[PDB]
Amino acid sequence: AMDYQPLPGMSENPSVYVPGVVSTVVPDSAHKLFIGGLPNYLNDDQVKELLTSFGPLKAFNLVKDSATGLSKGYAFCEYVDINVTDQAIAGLNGMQLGDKKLLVQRASVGAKNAGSGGSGSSGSGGSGGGVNDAFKDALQRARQIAAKIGGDAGTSLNSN
Numbered sequence: 253a254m255d256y257q258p259l260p261g262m263s264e265n266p267s268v269y270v271p272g273v274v275s276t277v278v279p280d281s282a283h284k285l286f287i288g289g290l291p292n293y294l295n296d297d298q299v300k301e302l303l304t305s306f307g308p309l310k311a312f313n314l315v316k317d318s319a320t321g322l323s324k325g326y327a328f329c330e331y332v333d334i335n336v337t338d339q340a341i342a343g344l345n346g347m348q349l350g351d352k353k354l355l356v357q358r359a360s361v362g363a364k365n366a367g368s369g370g371s372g373s374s375g376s377g378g379s380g381g382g383v384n385d386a387f388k389d390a391l392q393r394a395r396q397i398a399a400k401i402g403g404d405a406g407t408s409l410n411s412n
Contacts, residue, residue, distance in 0.1 A: 256411050275311035278328045283337040284358035287327045291352055293404045295323050302394040303329055304344055307336035328359055349395055409410045
């Protein structure tokens with residue numbers, strides 16, 4: 253048994269009462285983050301602990317292979333805190349966990365992803381001050397939870 257059922261009338265919880273928490277399909281918006289270069293053995297739930305560390309997440313849609321059923325190495329997610337997007341992406345881009353680092357860029361409804369030529373400018377500064385640079389705490393958290401799960405060999409859904 254590996255599922256979450258809330259108790260109707262007994263605690264509404266902070267933000268876990270919803271079974272299937274964080275939408276598995278992320279509605280196309282400008283606060284949609286694209287994470288590329290992530291381990292194929294990490295899916296939405298497992299990557300949540302890395303991404304949600306910076307702010308509250310609303311939806312998480314990993315690119316999953318339809319052939320055999322594993323992560324394709326990329327994911328799309330959106331912060332409910334639309335403001336946190338700019339800070340989180342600035343802190344999470346280049347997130348280096350062990351020997352693998354993720355490329356976190358903006359999907360923006362299939363805009364261009366980081367621009368890379370005109371469409372990726374006007375942001376070369378004014379990031380220091382608002383970004384909480386605790387990627388150390390996020391790293392430790394993520395890597396220890398990844399180890400806790402055993403690299404997709406268990407669960408960390410402690411919802412009781």
